[PDB]
Amino acid sequence: GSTEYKLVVVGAGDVGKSALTIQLIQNHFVDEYDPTIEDSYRKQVVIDGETCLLDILDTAGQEEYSAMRDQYMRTGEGFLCVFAINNTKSFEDIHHYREQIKRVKDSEDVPMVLVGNKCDLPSRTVDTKQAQDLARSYGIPFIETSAKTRQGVDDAFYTLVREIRKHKE
Numbered sequence: 491g492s493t494e495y496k497l498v499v500v501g502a503g504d505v506g507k508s509a510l511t512i513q514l515i516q517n518h519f520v521d522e523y524d525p526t527i528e529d530s531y532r533k534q535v536v537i538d539g540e541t542c543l544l545d546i547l548d549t550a551g552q553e554e555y556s557a558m559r560d561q562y563m564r565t566g567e568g569f570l571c572v573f574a575i576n577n578t579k580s581f582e583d584i585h586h587y588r589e590q591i592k593r594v595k596d597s598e599d600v601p602m603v604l605v606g607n608k609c610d611l612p613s614r615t616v617d618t619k620q621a622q623d624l625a626r627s628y629g630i631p632f633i634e635t636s637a638k639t640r641q642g643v644d645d646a647f648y649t650l651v652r653e654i655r656k657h658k659e
């Protein structure tokens with residue numbers, strides 16, 4: 491069968507989790523999507539010769555730490571940690587997302603990619619070098635994306651898949 495990869499998209503409200511997910515799956519930019527709608531999306535794609543089923547969870551809605559919520563997030567094999575390059579608070583929030591991911595996975599080594607979204611915008615408050623440097627601090631890859639222009643969208647998800655393979659081996 492297809493090799494399945496459970497990918498989870500996380501990060502602050504309004505960074506573009508939904509727009510990124512919809513661009514990957516449906517190949518168009520949706521600039522407006524209810525921020526409480528959380529759903530799973532699936533795509534058949536070949537990545538480095540391997541036929542893959544991508545199962546992508548677009549997180550949304552309320553922050554909460556029930557056992558049921560942890561159990562759901564725990565099924566993710568790798569995580570896209572998304573901030574917006576024009577929102578410094580979303581960048582500052584990243585450590586919190588990373589802390590929660592390590593917690594539910596019961597491991598200090600979880601496949602993760604730092605994603606700086608909205609790179610089409612002329613004004614930016616988080617420079618590329620600062621974000622590249624934070625990824626190096628964490629030991630994870632960094633990808634700049636725009637759900638609007640498609641820049642880096644495949645790169646970000648496919649890099650996460652490659653990180654999962656490395657962890658499994």
Ligand SMILES: C=C1CN2CCC[C@@]2(COc2nc(N3CCN(C(=O)/C=C/c4cccc5c4CNCC5)C[C@@H]3C)c3cc(Cl)c(-c4nc(N)cc(C)c4C(F)(F)F)c(F)c3n2)C1
Pocket residue numbers: 498500501502503504525526549550551552553554555556559560563564569583586587588590591594
């Ligand atoms: C420093 C902090 C701690 N908090 C204090 C406040 C800020 C912060 C949030 O923190 C914070 N938020 C989270 N939500 C809420 C905000 N949101 C949004 O999209 C909101 C959109 C929205 C909703 C309603 C109205 C509007 C909007 C946006 N438009 C305008 C109107 C992103 C995400 C769903 C959030 C979500 C999740 Cl799944 C998790 C998480 N949970 C677990 N149990 C286990 C694991 C492994 C994780 C994760 F790691 F895998 F993710 C978190 F941990 C989260 N954490 C950040």
Ligand SMILES: Nc1nc2c(ncn2[C@@H]2O[C@H](COP(=O)(O)OP(=O)(O)O)[C@@H](O)[C@H]2O)c(=O)[nH]1
Pocket residue numbers: 501502503504505506507508509510520521522523524525550607608609610611635636637638639
């Ligand atoms: N310019 C630009 N705007 C974006 C991009 N991705 C999302 N947005 C906008 O950012 C806002 C929040 O996007 P959304 O996908 O709902 O973020 P979410 O809350 O993380 O799911 C909306 O106004 C989108 O139009 C992008 O790559 N570039």
Ligand SMILES: [Mg+2]
Pocket residue numbers: 507508509523524525526527548549550
């Ligand atoms: Mg959303």
